[PDB]
Structure formats: structure tokens, C-alpha cells
């Protein structure tokens, strides 16, 4: 009944300017009214300002902004933890996907038995030793998964993080651009995923059925939905940093969100990677933002049948 909205204008998990304007873009697309109309009591935390870190040199000549991303996530986790502890379902607007380190950490701080539904073209599970880009937004899951920590070096600014997710407690949906070390990780740790190919075969209804059976088939658990807008086909969500052809249709995305709502267990949601500056037109920017609002609203009960 109660929803907290937090703007997290992270951009330092990656290298493209503009994703810090995602939260404003999503708000301007009418998020707050849409949620209110659904009966959500709202607490708006506004857009957070994160503490800068002087001299945040690369880590290992490769990983960018680790102290800045680490500290921003620590601060974000504090806000998320507080909101969830006060009884709010916590919606965080990104910002790049490295913020999931903070939202999931903060969420788990109040709800340790949470499970994660990760909707994304990408697995975001590179470690600092496997990333080819050095961009933390392609690594957040590696810092969160319990089974991987012997393979994850300690980054400056990251010491506060305690891995809070087990490999059996996250399911990916949407995957179509997975790096070879990520594929190894997913297979070696038996992490379950439904790639676009699996969706082509099963259909989104069976995908959602199987996802919930894996995560909440044995017991009810609070659900953390981490939704990267690039899960959608680039024709629908062009304003994003790493678009990949052959993504979710509009209807598939809504269906995912509807099924999330239908569990009655949604406890926190990330909507990340909307970058209005990468739109070639104001129309492309607005449609991406409108789509983000649609995902969030559907996750909190908007239906297509009244």
C-alpha cells in the first residue's frame, strides 16, 4: 500500500553521460500520479545527492570510479533500508545499474530472505577480474552473490558490502548479450536464467511461472525486481547506453510486471539505465521514459483489463 520513490542519479558505473537524468525523465513521464491512482501511499525521497570522493583513481588500471560508486551505493543502501524498514515498497529510479549494489544491499538489510528477479539484456555478473570494460554497472551481481566472493577482490569503497544473495535466489529474464566469463559463471554456479531464446521457446507466461517456482515455490519471500530498461527491444527503449537488438516486446514487459504484482510479494524495484541524452529525438526520450513508468505502474497493479 505504501511506496517509497528514490531518485538515484548514478552515472559513474559507466562512461556515457546522461543516465543521471533518468530519474527526472521518469518523474516527468508522470510516475507519481500513476502510482497514486493505483492506491499507493507515496513517500518521495526526491533525487539523492551522493558524496564525492577525491582522487578516485581507477582500480587496477581498469575499474573506473570504484570509491565513488562504492560510497554512493553505501549511502543509497542506507536510504533503502530505512524506507523498507518503515514499511514501504521501495522504487529506485536510475541512474546506471551499479546502483543495484546499494538497493539490494539496503533491501536485504531489512529483508534477508529476499529473492531477485533481474530483467536485463545483460547478466551484469562480471567480476573485477573478468570485466572487459571496467564499468561497474556490468558487475553489480558479482558483489552480491554469496557463492562468488572467493573470486571477487576487495575494491576501494566496497568494504561495507556483505554478499546477501545466494545463487539459487536470483533469476534472470531477457538475456541476450552475455560475456564468455559471465556464461561460465552462470553455468558453474547453476544460476537460473531465461534468455530471449528461452522466451521464444516457452513464452513469457511459462517463463514467469517457472521463475516464481524457482524463487517462491517453497516459501513466500519478498521480491526485489531489478529492471534494466535495455531488456526491452531498442525499438521500444532506444534511450539507453547498451541497447541490444531482439529484446522484450512491450507486451512481454508488461506481463513480467503484472506477474510480479500478482505475487503480492514485491518489496523493492529498480528501474535503471534510462538515458534521455542518448535519444536521437525528444520523442525517443519520452517514449523510453513512458515505458519505464508503464513497467513500474504494472508492477504495482496497473492491469490491461480494468
Ligand X SMILES: N[C@@](CCCC[B-](O)(O)O)(C(=O)O)[C@H]1C[C@H]2CC[C@@H](C1)N2Cc1ccc(Cl)c(Cl)c1
**Binding-site ranges for ligand X (CB under 6 A):** 97, 120, 122, 124, 126, 131-133, 135, 137-138, 177, 179, 228, 230, 242, 273
Q: Closer to ligand X by CB, 135 or 211: give it.
A: 135
Residue 273 annotated in ligand binding: yes
Euclidean distance between CA atoms 251 and 240, whole angstroms: 19
Q: Closer to Mn ion by CB, 119 or 266: give it.
A: 119
Closest residue by Cα to residue 137 from 282, 283, 272, 277: 272
Residue 294 annotated in ligand binding: no
**Annotated active-site residue in 124, 177, 252, 259:** 124
- In angstroms, the Cα distances linking 79 to 25, 29, 82, 159 are 21, 24, 5, 18
Residue 21 annotated in ligand binding: no
Angle, helices 204-216 vs 250-263, to 10°: value is: 30
**Annotated active-site residue in 56, 182, 230, 233:** 230
Residue 123 annotated in ligand binding: yes
The answer to whether 161 touches 220, Cβ cutoff 8 Å, is no
Task: Clarify whether 120 is annotated catalytic.
Answer: yes
Euclidean distance between CA atoms 159 and 16, whole angstroms: 26
**Annotated active-site residue in 20, 56, 96, 97:** 97
User: Quick check: 124 binds Mn ion (CB under 5 A)?
Assistant: yes
Q: Closer to ligand X by CB, 18 or 301: give it.
A: 18
Partner in contact with 211, chosen from Mn ion, ligand X, none, beta carbon below 5 to 8 Å by kind: none
Euclidean distance between CA atoms 136 and 155, whole angstroms: 11
Which range binds Mn ion by CB under 5 A, 71-79, 94-102, 149-157, 215-223? 94-102
Q: Closer to Mn ion by CB, 228 or 252: give it.
A: 228
Partner in contact with 12, chosen from ligand X, Mn ion, none, beta carbon below 5 to 8 Å by kind: none
139 burial via Cβ count (<10 Å: 0-12, 13-18, 19+): buried
Sheet with strand 223-228: strands edge to edge? 41-47, 2-7, 89-93, 266-272, 223-228, 115-119, 170-175, 192-195
The answer to whether 80 touches 106, Cβ cutoff 8 Å, is yes
Residue 108 annotated in ligand binding: no
Residue 135 annotated in ligand binding: yes
User: Quick check: 176 binds Mn ion (CB under 5 A)?
Assistant: no
Which residues are bridge partners to 93 per DSSP?
7, 271
Task: Clarify whether 137 is annotated catalytic.
Answer: yes
3-state secondary structure 81-98: HHHHHCCCEEEEECCCHH
Q: Closer to ligand X by CB, 233 or 273: give it.
A: 273
The answer to whether 279 touches 205, Cβ cutoff 8 Å, is no
- Rule CB under 5 A: choose which of 20, 120, 252, 270 binds Mn ion: 120
Judged by the rule CB under 5 A, the positions of this chain that interact with Mn ion are 97, 120-122, 124, 228, 230
Annotated binding-site members for Mn(2+): 97, 120, 122, 124, 228, 230
Q: Which residues are the active-site residues?
A: 97, 120, 122, 124, 137, 228, 230, 273
Amino acid at each position: 500500500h505504501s511506496v517509497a520513490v528514490i531518485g538515484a542519479p548514478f552515472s559513474q558505473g559507466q562512461k556515457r553521460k546522461g543516465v543521471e537524468h533518468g530519474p527526472a525523465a521518469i518523474r516527468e513521464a508522470g510516475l507519481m500520479k500513476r502510482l497514486s491512482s493505483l492506491g499507493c501511499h507515496l513517500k518521495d525521497f526526491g533525487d539523492l545527492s551522493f558524496t564525492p570522493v577525491p582522487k578516485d583513481d581507477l582500480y587496477n588500471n581498469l575499474i573506473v570510479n570504484p570509491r565513488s560508486v562504492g560510497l554512493a551505493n553505501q549511502e543509497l543502501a542506507e536510504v533503502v533500508s530505512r524506507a523498507v524498514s518503515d514499511g514501504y515498497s521501495c522504487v529506485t529510479l536510475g541512474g546506471d545499474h551499479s546502483l543495484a549494489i546499494g538497493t539490494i544491499s539496503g533491501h536485504a538489510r531489512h529483508c534477508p530472505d529476499l529473492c531477485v528477479v533481474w530483467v536485463d539484456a545483460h547478466a551484469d555478473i562480471n567480476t573485477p577480474l573478468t570485466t572487459s570494460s571496467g564499468n561497474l554497472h556490468g558487475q553489480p551481481v558479482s558483489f552480491l552473490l554469496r557463492e562468488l566472493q572467493d573470486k571477487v577482490p576487495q575494491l576501494p569503497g566496497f568494504s561495507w558490502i556483505k554478499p546477501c544473495i545466494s545463487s539459487a535466489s536470483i533469476v534472470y529474464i531477457g538475456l541476450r548479450d552475455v560475456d564468455p566469463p559471465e556464461h561460465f559463471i552462470l553455468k558453474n554456479y547453476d544460476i537460473q536464467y531465461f534468455s530471449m531464446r528461452d522466451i521464444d521457446r516457452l513464452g513469457i507466461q511459462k517463463v514467469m511461472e517457472r521463475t516464481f517456482d524457482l524463487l517462491i515455490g517453497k516459501r513466500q519471500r519478498p521480491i526485489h525486481l531489478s529492471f534494466d530498461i535495455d531488456a526491452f527491444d531498442p525499438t521500444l527503449a532506444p534511450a539507453t547506453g547498451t541497447p541490444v537488438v531482439g529484446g522484450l516486446t512491450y507486451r512481454e514487459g508488461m506481463y513480467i510486471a503484472e506477474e510480479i504484482h500478482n505475487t503480492g510479494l514485491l518489496s523493492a524495484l529498480d528501474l535503471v539505465e534510462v538515458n534521455p541524452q542518448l535519444a536521437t529525438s525528444e520523442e525517443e526520450a519520452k517514449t523510453t521514459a513512458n515505458l519505464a513508468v508503464d513497467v513500474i505502474a504494472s508492477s504495482f497493479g496497473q492491469t490491461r483489463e480494468g
